[PDB]
Design a protein around this ligand. Structure first.
Ligand SMILES: N[C@@H](Cc1ccccc1)C(=O)O
Ligand SMILES: N[C@@H](Cc1ccccc1)C(=O)O
Ligand SMILES: N[C@@H](Cc1ccccc1)C(=O)O
Ligand SMILES: N[C@@H](Cc1ccccc1)C(=O)O
Ligand SMILES: [Mn+2]
Ligand SMILES: [Mn+2]
Ligand SMILES: [Mn+2]
Ligand SMILES: [Mn+2]
Lengths: 346, 346, 347, 347
């Protein structure tokens, strides 16, 4: 009997089931309310019913929860201060997808040493998310797979599907069952169609494989997600300007889906240069003054300290994509609250 | 206390675990032998040790087990006949991924009526694969998610990551732990880099969430898949000709990965015209007579009967992409067997 | 270094298929469901004296070959039908006899009878046999030795037993309080009746115990209580099958405020482990039913195609556990009891 | 359409958190590991007659409050250290007393003592208490009532009991054969010693039984056998603690080829269910140790902070199960046995 099973597997180990984590860290009355309301409020932006600017803002990836709570602390004050112009939600991404060897995120490797203590990772991520909501900061994250959401999705008010997974059918099937509103990024080369197609798909009922709260293999039957939109993320060339928005809106209308879209100031719209994020936010501001009726949100990569670092030596600086610092963050948010005050007035 | 969990979920049903299917349909000694051996043979083609041509050929999708076994019976005679020039492996794909509402495949919806009997479908899928292996026909399939492989991967001699998932990180991580060699397709608009990257990634050790054979949520630690390669499936224009092969081989060598690749005669290389698959095969034959040192394989969409139909009314005719019938399949294989005979002699 | 404390004396823990995998392959049929439900109700009536038919739990000491069990059942079925107005005949389908010494652990635990413990196959086989029997019109009884096996096949059982060695165990009483069938509790191995009377009282209440869900995962079970429990007199230091022992036991049952209808085991210690004495016990019981026998709702008999026992399974339809009477004796015994009980019912 | 046959008498089946969830929150510590491993070994030495110290299993009849139990442990720890050359002291940590009538089902099953049966909390609390006791330097003993709970906290147990009710049970003996700790089998509730002598023989061999994995999945468990099993004299219709009974037990044990080293329970049927008689029993044991007492390797005592019992848990450190002796009496009893066994050990 020749072996044919698990030939290239080093190990398969049981994780604690989602219920174990839900038992230790149940969502509280206050978190529940924040999440439920924030999702509704985002739905309204998505469907053109309110004209505030959704701002998804925070670290490229979280590596230290201490600093993330500190960042949240400062961000909350601005969330309240711009609450009439801006709906600020924190970026709480645990991993950046990548091609080469490197750190696989807080869930996967919370100790940043390669011991992959995933049970700790998932506990830590739920805990941070619960603390954020408990202090009054709503959270957003990208879902990279079909299982992790069972651990902490109940605490997420806005989810993302990245450029690298927007065309994947099973990620669309996931999105169709996510309790939060979902943004689909255009593709790494600037293809927008894949994202538009994703919205259509994610709005219908689907089936996909996952585990139950008790941790057992299962088939999930979704009811459809009416709250999806596209995110302009750039490509071979940037796609943030009025000519690119207008054309995106036109494609969206022609597909019978929402022509309210979000713009990412980072990644390929900055040319992977964090200093250009402000240029992009400036261009967005300028659009919100002239007209910009098709814009419902913006994405921004921001931390306490500006820049990137290969090891986590320095407190509050990304080890993934380069972020703008806190001062640049005060300026950008102010700029956007100012421009949008004027759009809302009209 | 507002609800936040599963707001958009109709139902989550626990499935029968893999061990339940494996108890009913354990892999036999002969099947095990064939799988182990066919994987090794394909590995030799990927790495240039052997100059026979891998032919992945079969229906676009399986919607009937019976026709599939009869197809396999005919293919098997051609497999044995051409065994010195070709390595013939049957296409056993249970689902074509699609953007529009339609049939979701044999595993998902075995009764083809929207009843979604997944326990039945997974059983029926493993039974078919076991039966093919037992009669001597190795099998190939596309893995769309991270759970289904635990059901029948042990029976698969070659695996595909499709164009819509080649850039997905989790699917690359899956590939890194599959027991079979894996072909990655270029992107839907022709990007070849995502597949070149995918190879590099998938040769390394990774971690992904999945279930154990007993159906429990698990973390999977992989050892890397050294047998991965690219599949040219076309883009905005087809990419099968010698100039496209040579550019691809150069790019592959520059990434330090295998410069032996596979060409898909169907899909965007035929531009969804089944009658142009033969043309592609002819061009491939010409390249093999002249040089074709960078070609290790071909993909072809073939069925008993040519064409396609919306409902499964006609026996042995595709309900997904249009395929060439049996007569054309005989000419195509004779063509390729002869051309590669000359290449091998050289 | 850091010292081990877990599973020190364990060679292996293997996962079993869950009950649901077996239920998937062998779902209960309309006809089996009907027979089980009706038979449980019909036995209930005997426990509470609504009906004076005699329950006869009868069959092999243990099931070691299914073909033989099926053949046995085909013969028994003709007699079940023939005596249906006087007797309610349910087949014994026990898969293990508990023992103190090393030996065969039964068809569930070791179906291949070679020491491989192919428990997944054994459970599958036990379910298949029980389904087949119910499909042919023969209801089935069994003993439950643990708190997990029942999830595999209880749905196919019309009457269940808790043995002499477990009747006093609290968890087995908790089990019984949640079993869907009526349940017979045996007196202790030395003849204690108290432990069985106490178990009826206990099992009539709601309890909790640990078991697994149909999907196979650790669980707490909250029961409703089993109002259909009774005692079984099985001998001990002295036999307890006679009129005087029956009278003393019924007195004790009324004193505890539980059903004074009881079962009598003709085999085991009441027969002094001699299969030929099963007949003399039944004779005594027939005599009781003729005179009065108002406190008797059933009997238990160890019977097979072939009389005797054997150490290896060389002969077809001869037990490899306790020794059984043969088919001829079985025909006799049932005719005896059917005639004796016909008169009692006429009263 | 079908007649229902499944779970007719079941209120609910609730999935439990699996053992791995408890083991993550409360993993065993290096110190606790060392204490459990060593104490297990030490008790093995007493079972096989290599050390003449007396094993004392002492504590509350049941635990219904962990704060009182931790305070009890702290006081006991001081005598454990004081008498360490004469006595090997281990705390009795039983979470439940099996009973026939309606009553409280213990700390694991009903931690809030109100019938809300929050078993997840109960199991969590049980393991937390055991981990705290081992961490402070006090080893723990318990009774295993079923085949699932050991997966939750057995790794923290230095000595185990199978009580009078379950000693004859096949599955409980099978469980014993795989417990990482030494195991004491109590004689039967009417004085039968044979079932416990048998239990030893059986438990020393390899067995199979059904349980769950640490992941909570239905499993078959293959044991390697438990060579450290012994009997416990707990009385019967009449008490069984005196010289004559100990001698008769010992001859019986030698005759079966099993350890003739035994434990005497001062409480239960040996006190006549009267906590003031535990002291009489201990005095008698002590007289045996001064004379000869070569077959005794331990004793069992039900002791709490406060003496006696209560129906509702109104009073701190006082049993709601069996009546216990108080702390003062406990100090007398331990000084007594230490002094008697010091004389034996010197001989
Ligand atoms: N629990 C997720 C949905 C989900 C269910 C099952 C599997 C994966 C995701 C939510 O509420 O959004
Ligand atoms: N069982 C798969 C690998 C795998 C393991 C676990 C999860 C997913 C996939 C194989 O043998 O190829
Ligand atoms: N299913 C059993 C009851 C049961 C449930 C759960 C565990 C054990 C037993 C019956 O119908 O009789
Ligand atoms: N884990 C227990 C033994 C055991 C294993 C499995 C089930 C039940 C008990 C011990 O170490 O003692
Ligand atoms: Mn980033
Ligand atoms: Mn196709
Ligand atoms: Mn018998
Ligand atoms: Mn007690």
């Amino acid at each position: 009997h020749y072996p044919t099973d698990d030939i290239k597997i080093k190990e398969v180990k049981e994780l604690l089931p989602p219920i174990a984590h839900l038992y230790e860290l149940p969502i509280s009355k206050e978190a529940s309310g924040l999440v439920h309301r924030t999702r509704q409020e985002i739905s309204d932006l998505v469907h053109g019913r309110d004209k505030r600017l959704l701002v998804i803002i925070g670290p490229c990836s979280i590596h230290d929860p201490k600093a993330a709570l500190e960042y949240a602390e400062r961000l909350l004050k601005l969330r309240k201060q711009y609450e009439n112009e801006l709906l600020i939600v924190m970026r709480v991404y645990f991993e950046k997808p990548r091609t080469t060897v490197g750190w696989k995120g807080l869930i996967n490797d919370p100790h940043l040493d390669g011991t992959f203590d995933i049970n700790f990772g998932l506990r830590q991520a739920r805990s941070l998310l619960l603390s954020l909501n408990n202090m009054g900061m709503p959270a957003s994250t990208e879902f990279l797979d079909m299982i992790t959401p069972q651990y902490y999705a109940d605490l997420i008010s806005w989810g993302a599907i990245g450029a690298r997974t927007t065309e994947s059918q099973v990620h669309r099937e996931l999105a169709s069952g996510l309790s939060c509103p979902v943004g689909f990024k255009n593709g790494t080369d600037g293809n927008l169609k894949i994202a538009i197609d994703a919205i259509g798909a994610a709005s219908h009922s689907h089936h996909f494989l996952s585990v139950t709260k008790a941790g057992h293999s299962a088939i999930v039957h979704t009811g459809g997600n009416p709250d999806c939109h596209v995110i302009l993320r750039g490509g071979k060339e940037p796609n943030y300007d009025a000519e690119h928005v207008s054309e995106a809106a036109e494609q969206l209308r022609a597909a019978g889906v929402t022509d309210k879209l979000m713009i990412d100031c980072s990644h390929a719209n900055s040319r992977k240069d964090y200093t250009r994020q402000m240029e992009v936010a400036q261009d967005i501001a300028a659009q919100l003054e002239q007209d910009g009726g098709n814009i419902m949100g913006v994405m921004v990569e921001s931390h306490l300290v500006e820049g990137r670092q290969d090891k986590p030596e320095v407190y509050g600086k990304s080890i993934t994509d380069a972020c703008i610092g806190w001062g640049a963050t005060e300026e950008l948010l102010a700029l956007l609250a100012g421009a949008n005050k004027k759009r809302m007035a009209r």
